[PDB]
Design an enzyme around this catalytic site. Structure first.
Site, PDB file in Angstrom:
ATOM      1  N   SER A   1       0.851  -1.196   0.000  1.00 38.96           N
ATOM      2  CA  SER A   1       0.000   0.000   0.000  1.00 38.96           C
ATOM      3  C   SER A   1       0.883   1.241   0.000  1.00 38.96           C
ATOM      4  CB  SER A   1      -0.917   0.024   1.228  1.00 38.96           C
ATOM      5  OG  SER A   1      -1.559   1.280   1.360  1.00 38.96           O
ATOM      6  N   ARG A   2       0.817   2.056  -1.037  1.00 40.38           N
ATOM      7  CA  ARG A   2       1.685   3.212  -1.040  1.00 40.38           C
ATOM      8  C   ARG A   2       1.261   4.157   0.070  1.00 40.38           C
ATOM      9  NH1 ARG A   2       5.410   5.335  -5.787  1.00 40.38           N
ATOM     10  NH2 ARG A   2       6.205   3.283  -6.415  1.00 40.38           N
ATOM     11  N   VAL A   3       0.000   4.559   0.034  1.00 43.05           N
ATOM     12  CA  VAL A   3      -0.549   5.530   0.967  1.00 43.05           C
ATOM     13  C   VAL A   3      -0.263   5.067   2.352  1.00 43.05           C
ATOM     14  CG1 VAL A   3      -2.636   6.480   1.944  1.00 43.05           C
ATOM     15  CG2 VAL A   3      -2.530   6.052  -0.503  1.00 43.05           C
ATOM     16  N   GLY A   4      -0.166   3.750   2.476  1.00 41.20           N
ATOM     17  CA  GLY A   4      -0.398   3.067   3.729  1.00 41.20           C
ATOM     18  C   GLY A   4       0.241   3.676   4.963  1.00 41.20           C
TER      19      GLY A   4
END
Lengths: 57, 124
Positions: free
Chosen positions: B111-114
């Site tokens: 997950s980039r945002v993660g």
């Protein structure tokens, strides 16, 4: 069917496996011809036991 | 408008499989028969999901695109495309749901945002 770069992963995996394998064969072949060294070195002691253990009548 | 939306694109693969047809019917010069613009197809789409600045009412649309992988080959044309796009992805092996069930490959899945997503309760 299947991949290519997934067929490379297998080759190389196998190769590095054979390597590690044949390594130890030679390594365990180096531990046979040292078994004598401690096999021999025990040859005398055994002889000079049954020679003693000749067994009184 | 200020509400939060969630869009599930179930199987973008078939869209591309379709659009290819569409494009090949129109005799558009054809990697893997998919049109040169086959990337732009999904790009200008998933892009339309974001978080509008609080100057705009803090609205958002979340996108949950799908991709059907043959043999699990993530290196396939379509899959690299959809991946180079989404912020992170969750890869589902069947290699597993035949041990750990909802087959979620903790290894590849990102997950980039993660972490900026999870609340202080989750974060710690």
């Amino acid at each position: 069917m299947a991949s290519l770069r997934d067929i490379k992963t297998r080759i190389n995996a196998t190769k590095k496996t054979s390597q590690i394998t044949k390594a130890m064969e030679m390594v365990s072949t180096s531990k046979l011809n040292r078994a004598e060294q401690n096999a021999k070195s025990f040859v005398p002691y055994m002889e000079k036991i049954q020679e003693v253990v000749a067994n009184v009548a | 408008k200020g509400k939060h939306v969630l869009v599930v694109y179930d199987d973008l693969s078939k869209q591309a499989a379709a659009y290819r047809e569409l494009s090949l019917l129109l005799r558009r010069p054809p990697r893997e028969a998919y049109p040169g613009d086959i990337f732009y197809l999904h790009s200008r789409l998933l892009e339309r999901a974001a978080k509008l600045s609080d100057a705009k009412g803090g609205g958002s649309l979340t996108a949950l695109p799908f991709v059907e992988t043959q043999a699990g080959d993530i290196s396939a044309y379509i899959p690299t495309n959809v991946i180079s796009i989404t912020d992170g992805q969750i890869f589902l092996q069947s290699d597993l749901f035949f041990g750990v069930r909802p087959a979620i490959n903790a290894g590849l899945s990102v997950s980039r945002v993660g972490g900026a997503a999870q609340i202080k309760a989750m974060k710690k």
